[PDB]
């Protein structure tokens, strides 16, 4: 697919893609190295990140974002922006006078890289905290676990 759907050229800023080509420099292939990094904390770089072609500067694996801070989990509830999803974290808040709990939830707008295709509503996502990416986004989707019902 064409990765150049923007008014400006999309590229990985750390990759030089027009190193000089000559007869010896080209033998039936142009070649294009792919910048990717191994984020920490045991998270493995998805295969599509390594062998993909998308340009996403907020992607944890091939972009310019450092995963540091809280590592949370949520359930995907809305996928209707570009490269951003809304997940819902459900918890119980303890009211002490009644010695009981009440259901509460918080929505979280988190960045989803193009490396995670086939993400559905109800999927569980492990997200990691990064620097502010937009007005409301501060977490990047690190891992996707499909909801029970995969067959």
């Amino acid at each position: 697919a064409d990765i150049q759907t923007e008014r400006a050229y999309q590229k990985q800023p750390t990759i030089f893609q027009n190193k000089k080509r000559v007869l010896l420099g080209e033998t039936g292939k142009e070649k294009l190295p792919r910048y990717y990094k191994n984020i920490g904390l045991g998270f493995k770089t998805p295969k599509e990140a390594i062998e993909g072609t998308y340009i996403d500067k907020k992607c944890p694996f091939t972009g310019n974002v450092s995963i540091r801070g809280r590592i949370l989990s949520g359930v995907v509830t809305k996928m209707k922006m570009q490269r951003t999803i809304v997940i819902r974290r459900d918890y119980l808040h303890y009211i002490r006078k009644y010695n009981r709990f009440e259901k509460r939830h918080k929505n979280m707008s988190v960045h989803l890289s193009p490396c995670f295709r086939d993400v559905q509503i109800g999927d569980i996502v492990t997200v990691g905290e990064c620097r502010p990416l937009s007005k409301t986004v501060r977490f990047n989707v690190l891992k996707v676990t499909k909801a029970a019902g995969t067959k």
């Binding site: 150049q4 008014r7 893609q17 027009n18």
Partner: peptide
């Protein structure tokens, strides 16, 4: 500008 970037900006 060189390579594919030059072609992109020429087309734009």
């Amino acid at each position: 500008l060189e390579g594919k970037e030059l072609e992109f900006y020429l087309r734009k």
